[PDB]
Amino acid sequence: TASTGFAELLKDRREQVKMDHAALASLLGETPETVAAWENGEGGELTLTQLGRIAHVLGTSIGALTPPAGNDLDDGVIIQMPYYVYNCLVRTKRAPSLVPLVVDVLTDNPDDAKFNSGHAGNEFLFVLEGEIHMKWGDKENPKEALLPTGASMFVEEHVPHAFTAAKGTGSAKLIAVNF
């Protein structure tokens, strides 16, 4: 469907900027038959660089000329049967930014907490097991919190944060839902 989606979106955009096959073809150094072919679903072998040139001439992005991620749901639902190890939970092309994980935190030395520099999106966390020592903000003088099982947290986009199990408690587990 990449080729098919591109074929449809290419035609819509070309029409939108009032170009006929010949007009777009000239700008790209192609023949109008070649542009007609792309709109007939034959664009599959176009390279990333060529797509960039086409988007440029059409004053838009490759993204605007390609289809959305797709649908992997079953009547609207998708299920997943069951120092840091990441256990990936269910994801879906219908909500690409959703990345939920069960994180096993195996280090219990807060001095050795390493900061993720911040995310582009928000994050919700729940302490599944053990006790977590969370740190955030400025790596040099961070905000901190000892979080027992059952505690929950929200971390806003771009806020640096790190986690370790509470000093000498061995290990802990968190569910992290980035969205």
| Burial class for 35, CB neighbours closer than 10 Å (0-12, 13-18, 19+) | buried
Q: For residues 88, 89, 94 and 98, what is the CA-based torsion angle, rounded to 10 degrees?
A: -70
Kindly identify the residues of this chain, within the stretch 38-57, that bind its own copies according to CB under 8 A. 43-49, 51-52, 55-56
DSSP secondary structure, 2-35, as one string:
HHHHHHHHHHHHHHHTT--HHHHHHHHT--HHHH
Give the strand pairing for 172-178 and 143-147.
unpaired
Work out how close the CB of 4 gets to its own copies at its nearest, in angstroms, rounded to a whole number: 10
Q: Which of 12-33 are b and which e, b meaning 16 or more Cβ less than 10 Å from the residue's Cβ?
A: ebbeeeebebeebbeeeebeee
Residue 117, annotated as binding a ligand: yes
CB of 10 to its own copies, least distance (A): 11
Which range binds Co ion by CB under 5 A, 43-51, 111-119, 129-137, 164-172? 111-119
- Site for its own copies contains 95 (CB under 8 A): yes
Among its own copies, Co ion, none, what binds residue 32 when CB lies within 5 to 8 Å by partner kind? none
Among 26, 34, 66, 169, binds its own copies (CB under 8 A): 66
The single residue among 40, 59, 112, 114 that binds its own copies, judged by CB under 8 A, is 59
Is 141 among the residues that bind its own copies (CB under 8 A)?
no
In the window 85-104, what residues touch Co ion (CB under 5 A)?
none
59 is in an annotated binding site: no
Q: Was 161 annotated as part of a binding site?
A: yes
| Cβ nearer to Co ion, comparing 55 with 103 | 103
**48-57 helix and 21-28 helix, angle to the nearest 10 degrees:** 120
